[PDB]
Amino acid sequence: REFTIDFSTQQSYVSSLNSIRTEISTPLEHISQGTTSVSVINHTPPGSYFAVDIRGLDVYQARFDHLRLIIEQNNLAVAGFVNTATNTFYRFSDFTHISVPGVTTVSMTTDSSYTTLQRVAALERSGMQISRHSLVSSYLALMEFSGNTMTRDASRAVLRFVTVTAEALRFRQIQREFRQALSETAPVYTMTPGDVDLTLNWGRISNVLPEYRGEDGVRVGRISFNNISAILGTVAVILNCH
């Protein structure tokens, strides 16, 4: 199973994400108003995965279109990044249960946690700047990467792509704020501390929403939801808590 996330324009980027969401998840009958709904990841056998092809970074600088991510379906966890030009799967430590056929799997020493990636990158997610220019630079770091230990530039590149591909699928707020950077008058998306709080509390969040029967509001951790228009505008896909 393969998907394309096209960063050409805002429309192609949003349609790419919503294409993945409907294939791998199903909306809740309690929180769903039109096309905008909060979905639950479809149950899949553990170890299942889908591919993500990073297209559309820039058309004028000749087609940086050979980067691929491997994502575990059960938890939307990026297991690694694939260099299709070299047919090399640079895979993290904690995803040994993810084997991709037809490629070469370089098993590394670094795991996938934000604790390790932030340290090696020397870059805080709170205040991290993602733009179309910096996304192109993030692509180059991952393509020019070789070895089995994550370098500073690669982690400064993985942190950016995971935020705009994996966490963007989970949280609609992250997708909405970043997609502005793909416009003609390209701004710079700046990851606020509130955006970081969302990603750190995904497990707590996915455990709550199935309860929601249309009450007044919801407060999990520091995440205060005033109404359902906040839920639909902040969270997009939640875990399948069985």
Automatic annotation (TrEMBL):
Its EC number is 3.2.2.22. The active site is at residue 167. GO terms for biological process: negative regulation of translation. It catalyses: Endohydrolysis of the N-glycosidic bond at one specific adenosine on the 28S rRNA. GO terms for molecular function: rRNA N-glycosylase activity; toxin activity. Keywords: Disulfide bond, Hydrolase, Protein synthesis inhibitor, Signal, Toxin. It comes from the Bacteria. It is an enzyme of class 3 (hydrolase). The keyword Hydrolase applies. This is rRNA N-glycosylase.
